[PDB]
Amino acid sequence: PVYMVYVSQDRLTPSAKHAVAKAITDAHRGLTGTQHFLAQVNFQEQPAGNVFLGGVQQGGDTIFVHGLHREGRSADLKGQLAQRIVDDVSVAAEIDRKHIWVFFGEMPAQQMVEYGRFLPQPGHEGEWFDNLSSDERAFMETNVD
Amino acid sequence: PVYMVYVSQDRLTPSAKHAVAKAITDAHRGLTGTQHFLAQVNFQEQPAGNVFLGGVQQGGDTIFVHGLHREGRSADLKGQLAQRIVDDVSVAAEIDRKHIWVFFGEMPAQQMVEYGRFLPQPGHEGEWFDNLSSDERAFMETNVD
Amino acid sequence: PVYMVYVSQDRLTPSAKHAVAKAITDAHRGLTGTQHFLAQVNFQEQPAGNVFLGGVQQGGDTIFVHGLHREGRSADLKGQLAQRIVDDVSVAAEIDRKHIWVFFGEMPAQQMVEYGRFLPQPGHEGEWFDNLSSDERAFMETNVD
């Protein structure tokens, strides 16, 4: 999964990004079982006053999370991935919930690539990791937190 | 909805961005009936040079609009929406049409959170608005023009 | 198509962006038959340290290629397209493939606008260009490389 996190500039300190991007990652891993290193959190920063809202220019206190998952998960599961991400990013960012937008897109894994490899079905994963090369699995083990 | 509006840095003043948001949001409100505070417009600036049509580098003149909607609307309606957004962003930002690009992807409202709440269907949004805690309803009332 | 290309600030020199946009552009034209000029490469640059993998802040060495396409093409072709993007970008940017992430989404051509016109299916690619207005065609032609 790729999570695009849109935020106004200098709202999250370099430690506020780490805490939020960890909250997201633990949320995913716990709920779906996809390994930590498979999650990516990509903060898109823009100078504040670029988020309009019913024509109303906003400050720099709005966060939009765009997830990109592969298909195969129930709506039940996705509603729970979404609310936990509302609840935990509120904490790690220290921001009220009313400012959080969370959208999820889904795609067939067969047109989804991470670490230069095609992904497996959400009902796979453990097997897929082992049968990758040694150096590929080593580089993956580096990105855990 | 969220509209991601990809614009070259230096193309829109503060006044031009509000003109663009107001046209986008009004167009979305008038063809779907979505109440105003639900249509976010999210400006994303990159330095001129970062856009390559056909492998050719571009100046600050291209606008890519990326709308994210709940599923459920007709193609006819969506073709109207996509044709209005073209004409009204051409006006508000003094641009011409053949520089304007617009893509709509849609998602189950079950996996769309706004203001900390799950989007309903197009067949509900008024019943939805009414049964929110006083704070939620009131915060949304501010973000309307 | 429209490809968003998320990369770190300074990672790609301008000559590098051109080479990579040209790799992707050659990929799409080569395997889908879509004329060069309908292929946009929109580079989205951020400071190094906004990209997190497995909750760990990365250097500036991550690429994320997100392709927005017409619905229509075989899973098999979309695999190859994504594969040839992976290989060609690895080579144009001078970067390992385990740094490259590729997701394709798809939408109805009916909800897709490039140059202010509605895209056709993958089913009238050539006769479509034959009914633009000459000035729009002449505009099309400057974006071949």
Side-chain angles (χ1 to χ4, degrees):
Chain A
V2 175
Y3 286 91
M4 302 317 252
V5 176
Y6 303 84
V7 284
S8 293
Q9 216 141 291
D10 203 77
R11 221 313 189 187
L12 294 165
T13 77
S15 161
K17 286 180 179 85
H18 180 232
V20 128
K22 174 256 216 313
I24 295 158
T25 292
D26 303 27
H28 205 84
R29 165 259 158 202
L31 289 180
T32 69
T34 295
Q35 297 106 310
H36 272 181
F37 55 83
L38 281 173
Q40 173 178 160
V41 195
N42 184 317
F43 296 81
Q44 296 289 296
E45 284 162 300
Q46 278 283 313
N50 283 12
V51 181
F52 291 73
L53 216 58
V56 176
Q57 157 128 290
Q58 255 285 25
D61 232 20
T62 319
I63 292 134
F64 175 54
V65 193
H66 198 190
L68 309 161
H69 310 179
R70 45 219 153 86
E71 291 161 348
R73 300 194 170 87
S74 76
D76 197 2
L77 191 294
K78 288 179 290 193
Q80 284 203 351
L81 188 50
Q83 183 73 241
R84 181 175 154 156
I85 283 168
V86 161
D87 290 354
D88 289 26
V89 168
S90 91
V91 165
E94 325 174 329
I95 177 126
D96 221 287
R97 290 186 247 261
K98 61 229 173 176
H99 285 96
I100 194 42
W101 293 41
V102 167
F103 293 11
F104 292 155
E106 318 170 72
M107 295 149 300
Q110 285 75 49
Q111 70 209 33
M112 286 183 69
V113 177
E114 307 184 14
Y115 294 97
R117 305 296 291 229
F118 288 88
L119 282 191
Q121 306 300 154
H124 257 67
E125 304 164 323
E127 288 80 277
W128 166 86
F129 173 83
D130 291 355
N131 283 274
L132 293 195
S133 89
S134 297
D135 287 329
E136 295 178 298
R137 290 168 76 194
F139 179 69
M140 266 168 247
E141 193 267 1
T142 283
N143 297 317
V144 183
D145 171 77
Chain B
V2 179
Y3 289 96
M4 305 314 307
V5 187
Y6 297 102
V7 269
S8 243
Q9 194 66 65
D10 293 305
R11 195 64 171 87
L12 281 71
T13 52
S15 309
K17 276 144 162 153
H18 192 226
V20 159
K22 225 278 179 179
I24 280 167
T25 319
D26 289 0
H28 187 74
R29 175 257 158 155
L31 294 167
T32 72
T34 307
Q35 44 199 170
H36 222 295
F37 34 85
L38 276 207
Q40 161 176 171
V41 179
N42 194 309
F43 289 101
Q44 294 296 287
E45 294 175 278
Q46 283 287 312
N50 286 26
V51 169
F52 277 75
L53 312 178
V56 180
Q57 186 194 168
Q58 309 288 303
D61 228 338
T62 321
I63 294 172
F64 181 34
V65 185
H66 177 218
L68 294 325
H69 300 345
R70 9 187 208 176
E71 298 174 317
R73 300 221 188 62
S74 73
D76 332 289
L77 173 279
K78 270 175 304 170
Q80 260 216 290
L81 194 40
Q83 180 79 62
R84 197 58 203 170
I85 282 162
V86 168
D87 302 322
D88 295 341
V89 306
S90 168
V91 159
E94 309 200 33
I95 281 226
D96 52 295
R97 289 137 272 274
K98 320 300 133 194
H99 295 186
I100 290 155
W101 296 40
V102 224
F103 285 5
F104 300 155
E106 326 123 284
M107 307 161 303
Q110 285 57 33
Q111 53 203 69
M112 295 172 54
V113 178
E114 298 193 1
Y115 295 94
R117 300 296 257 193
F118 275 92
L119 281 196
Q121 319 270 153
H124 188 246
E125 55 239 353
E127 224 160 319
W128 194 71
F129 160 99
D130 280 333
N131 299 347
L132 305 160
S133 181
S134 66
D135 192 7
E136 311 177 80
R137 188 183 314 124
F139 199 129
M140 282 173 338
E141 274 145 69
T142 84
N143 278 314
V144 173
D145 206 339
Chain C
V2 160
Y3 291 95
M4 318 297 291
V5 176
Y6 303 88
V7 304
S8 274
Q9 163 81 297
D10 306 319
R11 190 42 185 85
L12 311 180
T13 61
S15 205
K17 290 183 218 150
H18 189 292
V20 152
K22 174 77 168 271
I24 290 147
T25 265
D26 287 310
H28 202 91
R29 199 279 273 176
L31 276 146
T32 70
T34 294
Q35 308 101 337
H36 297 97
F37 46 58
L38 285 166
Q40 166 162 177
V41 169
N42 188 278
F43 279 116
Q44 293 290 325
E45 256 167 325
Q46 295 285 303
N50 309 342
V51 184
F52 289 88
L53 301 183
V56 151
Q57 179 182 322
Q58 253 35 57
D61 300 300
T62 274
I63 321 195
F64 173 47
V65 183
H66 184 204
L68 305 191
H69 300 128
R70 268 117 90 208
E71 294 170 357
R73 300 197 189 101
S74 66
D76 309 26
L77 170 154
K78 292 183 285 170
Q80 322 183 28
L81 189 46
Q83 188 72 66
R84 144 149 268 182
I85 288 188
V86 158
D87 301 334
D88 297 356
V89 178
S90 164
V91 162
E94 279 183 341
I95 188 160
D96 193 296
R97 288 175 183 64
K98 287 68 141 193
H99 286 329
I100 314 181
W101 286 44
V102 184
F103 292 178
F104 296 172
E106 328 152 68
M107 310 147 289
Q110 278 116 53
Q111 49 212 67
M112 291 185 334
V113 168
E114 307 186 349
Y115 300 78
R117 297 294 252 245
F118 276 95
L119 291 210
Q121 232 66 56
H124 46 309
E125 51 293 332
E127 256 281 29
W128 176 88
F129 176 78
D130 279 49
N131 231 287
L132 293 131
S133 75
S134 300
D135 289 333
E136 301 174 46
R137 285 192 296 176
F139 196 54
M140 238 55 86
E141 291 180 333
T142 43
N143 313 324
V144 197
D145 193 342

